[PDB]
């Protein structure tokens, strides 16, 4: 909508206070004029029609219980598109300031949140399993990744491809969580993930297997459930960025790990330079050594610690 640019407050989803920028015309609505073509959060009022109604406030205030998921969608959207601007030079999820579009509400006690080609989608959760799933910044921008690959690499949702594509976002939706420095950690989804259980979380990158998935590509899922595993065999991609990072020992292979920094400079190139729709494991590792390489020179210690988390995960 047409209108002036200001800012409200309101609460998130976990209790925190936080500033929020809107537009006025009559109403407050939840449209972020300064990030690009903009961000725009929409209510789709416990239904599955998409996007829903732009959402309006009478005060510009939004201390509301049903308020606090679109304040943390719209509030998470606009962290991630300033990691992708400050850090990679990156213009939105297109490269080209495309506005960026949330429900939340969508359906009732849904269990996930989704990137669906054109839009984010936000469930509430059932208040069990999950608390409404725009409160964790990594789960934000983990789906918002999605739609940089999208537009990018192209990585068929698929087997070996849509783990490289599931890992590419949870590698990133961490990323931006150390970004926005708020209590980062190595885990997926652990501030909306089961609010009775205390220290778990949805997927670990530092060690999959706490959850069984797999951390070595001989532990690979090859049946057919999860589009072939690509929230499985994610967990093989991630231990490796998680190793590239942090370094360790992993079946007896040492890595030297080199940092946040520039795993995000390693895996940016990767992905925006050198993977296709349909790039599976082995191809991720001459990208990854490509883009190191492009970046550090053939014979830096960064190539070496991305040649010794690849084999310490057993792929060539
Ligand atoms: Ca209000
Ligand atoms: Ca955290
Ligand atoms: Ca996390
Ligand atoms: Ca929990
Ligand atoms: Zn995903």
Same mark, same amino acid.
């Given at each position: 909508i047409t209108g002036t640019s200001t800012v409200g407050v309101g609460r998130g989803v976990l209790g925190d206070?936080?500033?929020?920028?809107?537009?006025?015309?009559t109403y407050y609505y939840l449209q972020d004029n300064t990030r690009g073509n903009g961000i725009f959060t929409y209510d789709a009022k416990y239904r599955t029609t998409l996007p829903g109604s732009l959402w309006a406030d009478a005060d510009n205030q939004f201390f509301a219980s049903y308020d606090a998921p679109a304040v943390d969608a719209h509030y998470y959207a606009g962290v991630t598109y300033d990691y992708y601007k400050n850090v990679h030079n990156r213009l939105s999820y297109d490269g080209n300031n495309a506005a960026i579009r949330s429900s939340v509400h969508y359906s009732q006690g849904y269990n996930n949140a989704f990137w669906n080609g054109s839009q984010m989608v936000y469930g509430d959760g059932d208040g069990q399993?999950?608390?409404?799933?725009?409160?964790g910044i990594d789960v934000v921008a983990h789906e918002l990744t999605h739609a940089v690959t999208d537009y990018t690499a192209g990585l068929i949702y698929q087997?070996?491809?849509?783990?490289?594509?599931?890992?590419?976002?949870? @590698?990133?939706?961490?990323?931006?969580?150390?970004?926005?420095?708020?209590?980062?950690?190595?885990?997926?989804?652990?501030?909306?993930?089961?609010?009775?259980?205390?220290?778990?979380?949805?997927?670990?990158?530092?060690?999959?297997?706490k959850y069984g998935?797999?951390?070595?590509?001989?532990?690979?899922?090859?049946?057919? &459930?999860?589009?072939?595993?690509?929230?499985?065999?994610? %967990?093989? @991609?991630?231990?490796?960025?998680?190793?590239?990072?942090?370094? %360790?020992?992993?079946? %007896?292979?040492?890595?030297?790990?080199?940092?946040?920094?520039?795993?995000?400079? @390693?895996?940016?190139?990767?992905?925006? &330079?050198?993977?296709t729709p349909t790039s599976n494991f082995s191809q991720l590792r001459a990208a990854a050594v490509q883009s190191a390489?492009?970046?550090?020179?053939?014979?830096? &210690?960064?190539?070496?610690?991305?040649? &010794?988390?690849?084999?310490?995960? %057993?792929?060539?």
């Open positions: 206070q936080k500033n929020i920028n809107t537009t006025y015309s399993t999950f608390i409404p799933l725009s409160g087997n070996e491809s849509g783990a490289i594509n599931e890992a590419i976002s949870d @590698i990133f939706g961490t990323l931006v969580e150390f970004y926005a420095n708020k209590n980062p950690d190595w885990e997926i989804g652990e501030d909306v993930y089961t609010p009775g259980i205390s220290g778990d979380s949805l997927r670990s990158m530092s060690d999959p297997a998935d797999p951390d070595h590509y001989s532990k690979r899922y090859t049946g057919t &459930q999860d589009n072939g595993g690509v929230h499985i065999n994610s %967990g093989i @991609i991630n231990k490796a960025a998680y190793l590239i990072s942090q370094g %360790g020992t992993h079946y %007896g292979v040492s890595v030297v790990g080199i940092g946040r920094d520039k795993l995000g400079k @390693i895996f940016y190139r990767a992905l925006t &330079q050198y993977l390489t492009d970046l550090y020179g053939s014979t830096s &210690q960064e190539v070496a610690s991305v040649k &010794q988390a690849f084999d310490a995960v %057993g792929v060539k």
